[PDB]
Design a protein around this ligand. Structure first.
Ligand SMILES: [Mg+2]
Ligand SMILES: [Mg+2]
Lengths: 244, 244
DNA sequence: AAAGATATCTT
DNA sequence: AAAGATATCTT
């Protein structure tokens, strides 16, 4: 499948390669920093050619947002079936010691899931799947060595700010949790679990429909959630009683 | 001085080098994406080496934040002058055409400038200068970036997502404006002017003390600002009224 | 303008 | 946890 091939390519590529810096056309190389803003950018750039390569093999068109505040990172679709689009979003997070619990922010809950055309490349209803390619890296302490420039002949000497990158591909709804992933930027939070749980998809929602409904009626502040629902249990009781 | 040296170094380096992709230890080069998040990250990484080079040359220790959401990008100081720290923050924005007005987001106005230690590496009072290194780049007309990899031989054939870059170093207060830079993330907005004005430092505040007082008393919503002040004029009128 | 999107972190 | 930081954009 497009899915199996994509995950095989990512898993494979992720083990045989290591990004160590940005290069100038003049051949000068600049080291990488240890914070997620940097690694997030790197993993996205890294994944681009792989996604494109695998998509092409299955006859899929790949499109990136034309504007900045638009989801998803990649929109795939065959010319003959425009209303069956696949959204692929790359998400990153870090861990301090391998095998700790991790969590991701899964996108806003007040944009395209509530308004079919808000901050999204194509109307939400034209997508049949929302895939998350999650990267987890163990953070490494920045040393003095990563504060100078390098030359092409020194590629092997440049220190990396990450240690053990792990990658997975999973449907957004499957890994979605019941607590917000951010306050003022109102993001959906993922389950807070170990990497294997994301790969295996041991989430809390029974269906994508339950996921959507939960997040479409989630109130922005605990104050507003006090009389409604603050988690999946309370949401199910709320549903049972008639949504009141 | 440290400041003049840093400014000279920034002009040269930037005038001599153009970043075109990220590179793996194995020599494989991945091209840059077009979205602002990418360039914001690249310019920050492009500057680290320069800042560290000039800092060492002047007896200054350079420190980056441990927590990822702490200001500033770089804290410079002599071990002998602990309470004479300099803060440097890197900001970027784009222009579609080389001579349009630009503006930057300059950091929050509700964190450390109101609460001396919130989200800052060292207490605000230990800093005696706050510089902003701003990069302005002109986007390219094409909305479609390259989706294949390149090798060291092809450096000259990799398309760049930007057409031209300008940089400047200036004190934060000198270029601060009176309108917020962001809403839910409560950022200070800078003046909305031409590149030349940021270089020359043609701001709106009469002093850093005014800049600080203005932003320490600015309200989050226009509803609350309407009974206080919404711009420099109204703020000055608010001072006359007795700050009520 | 002003408010709220885009991604992720911290306590 | 929930709320509010980190950059910067868009409408
Ligand atoms: Mg930084
Ligand atoms: Mg900064």
């Amino acid at each position: 499948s497009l899915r199996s091939d994509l995950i095989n390519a990512l898993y494979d590529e992720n083990q045989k390669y290591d990004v160590c810096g940005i290069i100038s056309a003049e051949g000068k190389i600049y080291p990488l920093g240890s914070d997620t803003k940097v690694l997030s950018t790197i993993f996205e750039l890294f994944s681009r050619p792989i996604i494109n390569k695998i998509a092409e093999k299955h006859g899929y068109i790949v499109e990136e947002p034309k504007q900045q505040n638009h989801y998803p990172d990649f929109t795939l679709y065959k010319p003959s079936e425009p209303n069956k689009k696949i959204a692929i979003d790359i998400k990153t997070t870090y861990t301090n010691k391998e095998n700790e619990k991790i969590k991701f922010t899964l996108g806003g809950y007040t944009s395209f899931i509530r308004n079919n055309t808000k901050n999204i490349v194509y109307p939400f209803d034209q997508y049949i799947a929302h895939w998350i390619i999650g990267y987890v890296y163990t953070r490494v302490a920045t040393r003095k060595s990563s504060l100078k420039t390098y030359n092409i002949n020194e590629l092997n000497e440049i220190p990396k700010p990450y240690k053990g990158v792990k990658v997975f591909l999973q449907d957004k709804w499957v890994i979605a949790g019941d607590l917000a992933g951010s306050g003022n930027t109102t993001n959906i939070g993922s389950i807070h679990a170990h990497y294997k749980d994301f790969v295996e998809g041991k989430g809390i929602f029974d269906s994508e429909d339950e996921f959507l409904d939960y997040w479409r009626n989630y109130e922005r502040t605990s104050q507003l959630r006090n009389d409604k629902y603050n988690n999946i249990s309370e949401y199910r009781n709320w549903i049972y009683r008639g949504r009141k």
